Design a protein around this ligand. Structure first.
Ligand SMILES: *[C@@H]1O[C@H](CO)[C@@H](O)[C@H](O)[C@H]1NC(C)=O
Ligand SMILES: [Cl-]
Ligand SMILES: [Cl-]
Ligand code: NI
Ligand code: NI
Length: 430
């Protein structure tokens, strides 16, 4: 895509800490950038909208290549349109923001500079952040995660991407998402189908696949930590159903693992660890520090709240696994007990570790779920199962919760607040 400037693009500043072996940390002057899908796209250098509602303009966009030549991305009013603000080391994302239109959430990337995403190599290192999920009810997901995106958004590979990282291009993840309007310097107009339950979204003929490490997906009720490997570490474009993922006729027919080897303490039999108020070990009405440590043998986790350190609880009642670590033994035991082969079919932790040994881009988002109402995170899922089905129970939310139109109407002032990001070798951030 091209770049237009009737709306200025200024990336909100966000401080974070880089720590070194020995525990010295120094402040990094980062910034964040809004994903290109949230932006206004119109004719370059000026003219009609290329995309409006959930359909493309056929004249401007007769094919994928011509569309990208004819259409530009605009700048973003982060606070006024998207409900995104920063202060020092703190980032806030509001759920519903009303201005010209109703905006729902956001997806943002941490930048090293105004033209480059920050690239984190996770293996042998740890990532720490603080989060306030108190204003995230059932059906919402405040997510902090990593994907194997190109640092320049693909600009050096695809000359028709003139927008680059400055405009939040180049997203990919383990779903091989097909809802993206621009992939690898081309529009996704050919075969585009509007969503039946969402006025603003659709599904195109291509998707964008890459490795993904979901450090944090959570609301005030439930949370999960999930590696997702892909057969190719970095970005690849897929076609149609061969993308796999939720919006495809065969979920597992692609090159990424859309399920992942997930660790949700509630799903793993600990129903008192995480939740609102003093009945839980980690009280979700108050700020939580979440630390995640990556090794060739596994992923370890601890929390700090009110100055008190709590390690990840052990899996409870999982046949053949007694630890608290995402390692190959856990991922196999999980598949054996709960079902599925996707994670190991796509190369498991060995393949995940290849992505963790290269640069990954930090993604911060807030979303509601137009496929499954977030029931997979915070309720019983699938709903035709009950608590007696192994792995069915993931949280205490009602099976009727999380319908997007309902949560958007009911809880529009929901928000997530991420802060105090720290990164360095294992043991260095604490
Ligand atoms: C849940 O985790 C807490 C904190 O680690 C622990 O004290 C408690 O025994 C765990 N519950 C079960 C059922 O294992
Ligand atoms: Cl229980
Ligand atoms: Cl419970
Ligand atoms: Ni194609
Ligand atoms: Ni219980």
């Amino acid at each position: 895509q091209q770049v237009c400037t009737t709306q200025a693009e200024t990336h909100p500043a966000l401080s974070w800490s880089k720590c070194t072996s020995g525990g010295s940390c120094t402040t990094q002057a980062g910034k964040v950038v809004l994903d290109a899908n949230w932006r206004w796209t119109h004719a370059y250098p000026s003219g009609n909208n290329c995309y409006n509602g959930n359909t493309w303009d056929a004249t401007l966009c007769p094919d994928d290549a011509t569309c990208a030549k004819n259409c530009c991305l605009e700048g973003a009013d982060y606070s006024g349109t998207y409900g995104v603000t920063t202060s020092g080391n703190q980032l806030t994302i509001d759920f519903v923001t009303q201005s010209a239109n109703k905006n729902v959430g956001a997806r943002l990337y941490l930048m090293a500079s105004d033209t480059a995403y920050e690239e984190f190599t996770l293996l042998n290192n740890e990532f720490s952040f603080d989060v306030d999920v108190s204003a995230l009810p059932c059906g919402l997901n405040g997510a902090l995660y990593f994907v194997s995106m190109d640092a320049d958004g693909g600009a050096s590979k695809y000359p028709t991407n003139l927008a680059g990282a400055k405009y939040g291009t180049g997203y990919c993840d383990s779903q091989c998402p097909r809802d993206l309007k621009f992939i690898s310097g081309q529009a996704n107009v050919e075969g585009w189908q509007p969503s039946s339950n969402n006025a603003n979204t659709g599904i195109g003929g291509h998707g964008s696949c890459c490795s993904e490490m979901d450090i944090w997906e959570a609301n005030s009720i439930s949370q999960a930590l999930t590696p997702h490997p892909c057969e190719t570490v970095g970005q690849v474009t897929c076609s149609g159903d061969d993308c796999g993922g939720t919006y495809s006729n065969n979920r597992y027919g692609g090159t990424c693992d859309p399920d992942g080897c997930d660790w949700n303490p509630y799903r793993l039999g600990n129903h008192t660890f995480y939740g609102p108020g003093s009945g839980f070990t980690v009280d979700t009405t108050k700020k939580i520090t979440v630390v995640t440590q990556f090794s060739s043998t596994g992923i370890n986790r601890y929390y700090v709240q009110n100055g008190v350190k709590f390690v990840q609880p052990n899996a409870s009642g999982l046949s053949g696994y007694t630890g608290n670590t995402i390692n190959s033994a856990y991922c196999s035991a999980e598949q054996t007990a709960f079902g599925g082969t996707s994670f190991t079919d796509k190369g498991g932790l060995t393949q995940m570790n290849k992505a963790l040994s290269g640069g990954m881009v930090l993604v911060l988002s807030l979303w509601d779920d137009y496929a499954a109402n977030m029931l997979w995170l915070d309720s019983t899922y699938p709903t035709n199962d009950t608590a007696s089905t192994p792995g069915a129970a993931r949280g205490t939310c009602s099976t009727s919760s999380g319908v997007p139109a309902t949560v958007e109407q009911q809880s529009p002032n929901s928000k997530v607040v991420f802060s105090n990001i720290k990164f360095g070798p294992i043991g260095s951030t604490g």
